[PDB]
Amino acid sequence: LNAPQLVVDDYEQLIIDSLVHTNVVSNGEFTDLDASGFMRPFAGTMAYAGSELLYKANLASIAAAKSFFKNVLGVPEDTGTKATTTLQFGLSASLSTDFIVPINFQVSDLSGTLRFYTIGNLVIPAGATFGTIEAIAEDIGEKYNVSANFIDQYSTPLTYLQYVTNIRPATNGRSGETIDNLIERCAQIIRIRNPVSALDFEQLAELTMGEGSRCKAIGLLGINKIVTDPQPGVVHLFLLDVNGNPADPVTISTVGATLQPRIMLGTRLLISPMEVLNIELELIALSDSSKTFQQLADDILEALKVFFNPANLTPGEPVLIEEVKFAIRSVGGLSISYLQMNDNAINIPMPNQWTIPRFSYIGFELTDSEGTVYRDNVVTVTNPEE
Amino acid sequence: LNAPQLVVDDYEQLIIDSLVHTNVVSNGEFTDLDASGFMRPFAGTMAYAGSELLYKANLASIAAAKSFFKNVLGVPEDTGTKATTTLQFGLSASLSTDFIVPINFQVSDLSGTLRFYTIGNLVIPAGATFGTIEAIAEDIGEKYNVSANFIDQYSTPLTYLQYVTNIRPATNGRSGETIDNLIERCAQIIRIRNPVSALDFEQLAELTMGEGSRCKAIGLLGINKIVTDPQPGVVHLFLLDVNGNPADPVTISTVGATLQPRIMLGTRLLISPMEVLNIELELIALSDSSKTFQQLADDILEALKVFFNPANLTPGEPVLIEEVKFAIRSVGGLSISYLQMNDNAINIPMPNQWTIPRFSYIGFELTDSEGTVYRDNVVTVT
Amino acid sequence: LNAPQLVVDDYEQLIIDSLVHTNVVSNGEFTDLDASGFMRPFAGTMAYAGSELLYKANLASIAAAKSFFKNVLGVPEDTGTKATTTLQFGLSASLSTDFIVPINFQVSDLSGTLRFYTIGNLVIPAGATFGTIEAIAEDIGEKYNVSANFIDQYSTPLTYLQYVTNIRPATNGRSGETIDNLIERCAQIIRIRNPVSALDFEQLAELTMGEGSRCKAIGLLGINKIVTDPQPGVVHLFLLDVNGNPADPVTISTVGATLQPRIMLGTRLLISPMEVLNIELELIALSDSSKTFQQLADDILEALKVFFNPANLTPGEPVLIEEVKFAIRSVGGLSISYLQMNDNAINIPMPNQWTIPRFSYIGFELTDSEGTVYRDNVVTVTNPEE
Amino acid sequence: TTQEFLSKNKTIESELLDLLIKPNTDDSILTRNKQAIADRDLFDIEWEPGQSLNKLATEYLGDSFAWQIIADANGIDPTKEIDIGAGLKVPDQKALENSIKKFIVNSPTGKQLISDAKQSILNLIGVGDSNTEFSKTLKDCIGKVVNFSFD
Amino acid sequence: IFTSQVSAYIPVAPSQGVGKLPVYEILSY
């Protein structure tokens, strides 16, 4: 990714340098150095071939590195991930026999543009009416990540079937991962052998529990979770599941079973769910009117959701208000006048080593040059009680 | 609307139609239509002469349009310009009288293909050893555009004439002009517009003092620069020079001589130098160890030089500490913990509406996670 | 266009002159000067080609001028404007579902000769009873400038659609522009650089506000609108919108924003709506019986509607009764005996500089030779304060 | 009521009413000769006593009215004296067809192949209305009864 | 020899609110 350039490979630069050097080697006889003059056809013809060849010549080192990463490591290529959700079907009435919603059953939203298909056969037992199964998006891409209760139509009208819905927001819809994440994944393969110092971190945060999860390893921490009483031979693991919540004990047990043959004999592994600290933001900003207030609002929302993604966060580390301000301003088209984090402008320390931030509320105060103030107090957490 | 076509599309059709008209006039008594007929030679000769006449009419309408362009619009049509250069003739001795080079003195390059002629008479006065005079190419075309000293051969030597050369490279040689270029050049004359707004008034000043200079136009601001006392019909111009300093009186006069004939009636144009406020920076930041301390210092210094460029600054606007912090952190490898502008952590408002900021000092106090402290002081004044 | 004619171009004239000059060239040796005699075949054949060539030779200067007006300053070749109105559709009953009036819905007047089509789809939400949408005339022309509620007949029936009617009198019907109007349009492009004079300002404001609007620029007119108190550096604009009414505040704001980056720095721009003076006409005229009374009345009404077009009127200038009589009589087939404007026979001065006339009512009393008196009355505007 | 407006620097309504003058090189008398015949398809003859453009158009192009092309290929006014020994460029017959350019132009109806060249060659090729289809000639007579104003 | 047969053709060218609702009960919470 940082391969040094072997030679200068640029059409205009090649033309100009060729004219200058032809003046140099002729010992002043060649005085036509105009980059757009009568020698432009000759130099440009030469530079077209020269650039198209040097561009390929500059790829040698990166090609070697990618060949190493692809052949002897055999890392898979990320085409993109289809969003998956959990559908729930409800029947019209209690049947005397088992009912089957067949595999590849197409469902959609009100518009019919987003379409999901069931993963497998769904068997509602006799007498039961309303039950559940997983569905996958028709195509890859982040456009299939939809909120709960958004999919309610099914195209084929089946007998005794009354309604369908999604009880989860569809997630993990992606059109291909980043290069840096792939580089990290490749490097971790190399050093993941005999999980020792903070390697339990990486064996779980993306493996054996799912993508979009978080781990946190603390050495010699007992069940009392007190740092001042260290017990040697103990590793404490803190988990946040693929859904972004503290881990389900089933996932805890799966993690323990996965890591049991990999820990040092005689040592003790402790696993408990992570904790989440709610972040309440208040922003007073000045806009340049290059975007509408709604556009600024949702842009800042997306920027904060990216910033407060558990994949982008490190458990136990303080939330620095300057970093949040930089993340907000990176949207552009605005000037930040004031920011409050949990009723203060100071950095937030985390309650303990295993607490992850999660931002829940953002209050918008956006004035512009004309003088119109925009107020928008939005909640981003799933509260049924606000 | 659409211009009518002047030439006849088909002249043989014209001849046939005129013979059919002969038939119509005579009420079906003239049916002889071949060349052996009586009236065919007359009709054909008339048609050919008329084709010539309509070709001349087409040329005449085109020439009338071009003459309207040349005389009224002010844009002449170019059919080829002969390249011009500045020949210097150097004598081998200091004559006591005038050395007279006659008109049309022929000089040429080594091959002799490109030949230039002096436009006038060169008069080297007594006691002078060299003289200059402009020469024009023998013909139009781009092939007469050569570099300096390439036009030095002359066939008729003169006594006491040591050398003849062209100090300038021959330029302005063109072989013609397409209709698209002429039309666009005509349209450029119509588009011309005097500055009427503050921004347009500033752009002319920027263009007059070249790249790297700034201007601020303020309406109703008197010669005493008192905002509370407006003066009707006054446009005050404040200039920051090409070097970033307030404009000196010479530059003031240079921009005044250019902007004076452009203002319209009832407006008083005043031009004054800009005012500069120095910005002092004290920075404490935490490097994440992804870059060396020296690289971070260089990157932050360059980013802050770009941020405080006169082009990027709006005169009369306060310096926002948050925007400076964003500019610094946009480097990427650091994390700002403390920033102080002029011994404060608040926005600096300008003294007036024409003061531009100019940072003159920065203090780096960078720290890594290991506690290493890199300290440096940079003075950015000229 | 009024360009000088280089040579005489006429068939019969060419024949006659060619015979006379043939007589002249010889010393009277050729005496067959009869323009329709036995030399008519020869002379007519030559004159056919002569005329078909000189007709094109006479077009050189106008062709050059047209090429200049077309190439260097492209000017669209205006063809006309279609009248537009605002239809209202009302349903027969409150529906449980949302009604849709499709795009291009055809409506017409009682006669059935004037037809309008809806601009787009109209969606009346469930429970509503009426919905409005804009409609455009079928063809260009000033005959589509109909009054309010004049368009109510529709052919295609919709379910539960009770009525449709235009709530706005259709306006901006234009059959095209004359050569002098196109000349003015071309010349304004030549000289609008820096809006400085009254004219310059008006032309700019009429642009960006629509076709069929009007502007009046007055210098040194303060907020009190009193002429005797001049305020240097103040330009007051008075606006009549595209509909022929005093300008709506949103149009005022739009024109202000348009003209802000073009006014001299330090100057103050004031914009307010124009005022309308209503003209009531009473005509007593004698008919020559070359047209029916209805045809005469229609022709006179059309001529007066052309005369009192705000495009043909200069705001603040007095209406001259002789000019009105000439415009009426240019219809032809009648002899004017008496004309009253606003209950008098004298010229009508506008109350101030920014008042436009707008003729509202006209009464006809037409007498023929046989003694039939045709009396009629036409009201052209919906209401006095429109 | 009066709304106050003060000189701004640049709005977005200055982009509303923007360009008023558009330099366009569409079909007009000064654009008939935009297209040029390639130099490879020409013949470089010399002017001799007894020569005329009629003779050159007859020998070389087989048609006496083709001289308009030759003059248009040389930029000369025919009635001006072409001196003896002056060079001229005579177009070929068979090589005049490759000076016609072919463009696919778009339309709401559909894409159309269009020939564009200098108008002299367009008239020479379309002489006798052979290239145009009968539908166009029939259409030109759809409007037959021409309205005129009585004066 | 390779032979080609092409079959081609030319297409033709170009209110404030609802009326009545059932009575609701509203409970402040």
Short mmCIF file of N, CA and C in Angstrom, two decimals, chain B residues 84-135:
data_model
loop_
_atom_site.label_atom_id
_atom_site.label_comp_id
_atom_site.label_asym_id
_atom_site.label_seq_id
_atom_site.Cartn_x
_atom_site.Cartn_y
_atom_site.Cartn_z
N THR B 84 7.24 38.90 -35.84
CA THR B 84 8.06 40.07 -35.58
C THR B 84 9.09 39.77 -34.51
N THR B 85 10.26 40.38 -34.65
CA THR B 85 11.33 40.24 -33.67
C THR B 85 12.02 41.58 -33.51
N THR B 86 12.96 41.64 -32.58
CA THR B 86 13.74 42.85 -32.32
C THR B 86 15.20 42.55 -32.66
N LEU B 87 15.65 43.03 -33.81
CA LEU B 87 17.04 42.87 -34.20
C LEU B 87 17.91 43.90 -33.51
N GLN B 88 19.09 43.46 -33.10
CA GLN B 88 20.14 44.33 -32.59
C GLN B 88 21.34 44.24 -33.53
N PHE B 89 21.80 45.40 -33.99
CA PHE B 89 22.96 45.52 -34.85
C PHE B 89 24.10 46.09 -34.02
N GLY B 90 25.23 45.39 -33.99
CA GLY B 90 26.38 45.80 -33.22
C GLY B 90 27.54 46.13 -34.14
N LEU B 91 28.10 47.32 -33.95
CA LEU B 91 29.15 47.84 -34.79
C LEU B 91 30.52 47.33 -34.34
N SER B 92 31.46 47.35 -35.28
CA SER B 92 32.84 47.01 -34.97
C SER B 92 33.69 48.22 -34.60
N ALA B 93 33.15 49.43 -34.73
CA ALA B 93 33.88 50.64 -34.39
C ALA B 93 32.89 51.73 -34.02
N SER B 94 33.37 52.71 -33.25
CA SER B 94 32.54 53.81 -32.77
C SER B 94 32.66 54.96 -33.77
N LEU B 95 31.70 55.05 -34.68
CA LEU B 95 31.71 56.09 -35.70
C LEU B 95 31.55 57.47 -35.08
N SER B 96 32.14 58.46 -35.73
CA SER B 96 31.94 59.86 -35.36
C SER B 96 30.68 60.44 -35.98
N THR B 97 30.02 59.71 -36.88
CA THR B 97 28.77 60.17 -37.48
C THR B 97 27.68 59.13 -37.29
N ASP B 98 26.54 59.33 -37.94
CA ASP B 98 25.41 58.43 -37.79
C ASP B 98 25.56 57.23 -38.72
N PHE B 99 25.40 56.03 -38.16
CA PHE B 99 25.40 54.80 -38.94
C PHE B 99 23.95 54.53 -39.35
N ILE B 100 23.69 54.56 -40.65
CA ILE B 100 22.34 54.46 -41.17
C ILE B 100 22.16 53.09 -41.81
N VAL B 101 21.30 52.27 -41.21
CA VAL B 101 20.87 51.01 -41.81
C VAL B 101 19.57 51.29 -42.57
N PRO B 102 19.54 51.10 -43.89
CA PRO B 102 18.34 51.42 -44.66
C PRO B 102 17.18 50.50 -44.30
N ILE B 103 15.99 50.87 -44.78
CA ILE B 103 14.83 50.03 -44.56
C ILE B 103 14.98 48.72 -45.32
N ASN B 104 14.21 47.72 -44.89
CA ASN B 104 14.16 46.41 -45.55
C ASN B 104 15.54 45.77 -45.62
N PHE B 105 16.31 45.89 -44.54
CA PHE B 105 17.58 45.19 -44.45
C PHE B 105 17.30 43.71 -44.23
N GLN B 106 17.74 42.87 -45.16
CA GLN B 106 17.41 41.46 -45.13
C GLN B 106 18.36 40.70 -44.22
N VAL B 107 17.80 40.01 -43.23
CA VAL B 107 18.54 39.07 -42.40
C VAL B 107 17.86 37.71 -42.53
N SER B 108 18.57 36.67 -42.13
CA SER B 108 18.04 35.32 -42.30
C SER B 108 18.73 34.39 -41.32
N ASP B 109 18.17 33.19 -41.18
CA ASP B 109 18.76 32.17 -40.34
C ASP B 109 19.87 31.46 -41.11
N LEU B 110 20.41 30.40 -40.51
CA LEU B 110 21.53 29.70 -41.12
C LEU B 110 21.13 29.04 -42.44
N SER B 111 19.94 28.44 -42.49
CA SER B 111 19.48 27.82 -43.72
C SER B 111 19.05 28.84 -44.76
N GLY B 112 18.74 30.06 -44.34
CA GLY B 112 18.26 31.07 -45.26
C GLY B 112 16.80 30.94 -45.63
N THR B 113 16.10 29.93 -45.11
CA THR B 113 14.69 29.78 -45.42
C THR B 113 13.86 30.89 -44.79
N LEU B 114 14.11 31.19 -43.52
CA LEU B 114 13.38 32.23 -42.81
C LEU B 114 14.11 33.55 -42.97
N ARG B 115 13.45 34.53 -43.58
CA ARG B 115 14.06 35.81 -43.89
C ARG B 115 13.23 36.92 -43.25
N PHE B 116 13.91 37.85 -42.58
CA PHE B 116 13.28 38.98 -41.93
C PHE B 116 13.78 40.28 -42.54
N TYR B 117 12.95 41.31 -42.48
CA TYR B 117 13.26 42.63 -43.02
C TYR B 117 13.01 43.68 -41.96
N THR B 118 13.91 44.65 -41.87
CA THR B 118 13.74 45.74 -40.92
C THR B 118 12.52 46.58 -41.29
N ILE B 119 11.73 46.95 -40.28
CA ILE B 119 10.51 47.70 -40.53
C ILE B 119 10.82 49.14 -40.94
N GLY B 120 11.92 49.70 -40.44
CA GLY B 120 12.24 51.09 -40.70
C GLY B 120 13.72 51.35 -40.93
N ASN B 121 14.13 52.60 -40.78
CA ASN B 121 15.53 52.99 -40.89
C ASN B 121 16.15 52.97 -39.50
N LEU B 122 17.30 52.31 -39.37
CA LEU B 122 18.01 52.27 -38.11
C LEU B 122 19.07 53.37 -38.11
N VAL B 123 19.06 54.19 -37.07
CA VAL B 123 19.97 55.33 -36.97
C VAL B 123 20.78 55.14 -35.70
N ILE B 124 22.00 54.63 -35.83
CA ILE B 124 22.90 54.53 -34.69
C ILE B 124 23.61 55.87 -34.56
N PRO B 125 23.39 56.60 -33.47
CA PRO B 125 23.98 57.94 -33.35
C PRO B 125 25.48 57.87 -33.15
N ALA B 126 26.13 59.01 -33.34
CA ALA B 126 27.57 59.10 -33.17
C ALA B 126 27.96 58.75 -31.74
N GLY B 127 28.97 57.90 -31.60
CA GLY B 127 29.41 57.47 -30.30
C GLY B 127 28.66 56.29 -29.72
N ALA B 128 27.78 55.66 -30.49
CA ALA B 128 27.05 54.48 -30.06
C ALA B 128 27.49 53.29 -30.89
N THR B 129 27.65 52.14 -30.25
CA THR B 129 28.19 50.96 -30.92
C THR B 129 27.13 49.93 -31.28
N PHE B 130 25.89 50.09 -30.82
CA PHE B 130 24.85 49.13 -31.16
C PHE B 130 23.51 49.83 -31.19
N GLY B 131 22.56 49.20 -31.88
CA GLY B 131 21.22 49.75 -32.00
C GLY B 131 20.21 48.64 -32.14
N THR B 132 18.95 48.97 -31.88
CA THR B 132 17.86 48.02 -31.98
C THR B 132 16.79 48.54 -32.93
N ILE B 133 16.17 47.62 -33.67
CA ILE B 133 15.04 47.96 -34.53
C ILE B 133 14.24 46.68 -34.76
N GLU B 134 12.93 46.83 -34.90
CA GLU B 134 12.08 45.66 -35.09
C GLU B 134 12.11 45.21 -36.54
N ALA B 135 12.04 43.90 -36.73
CA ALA B 135 12.02 43.28 -38.05
C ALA B 135 10.79 42.40 -38.17
#
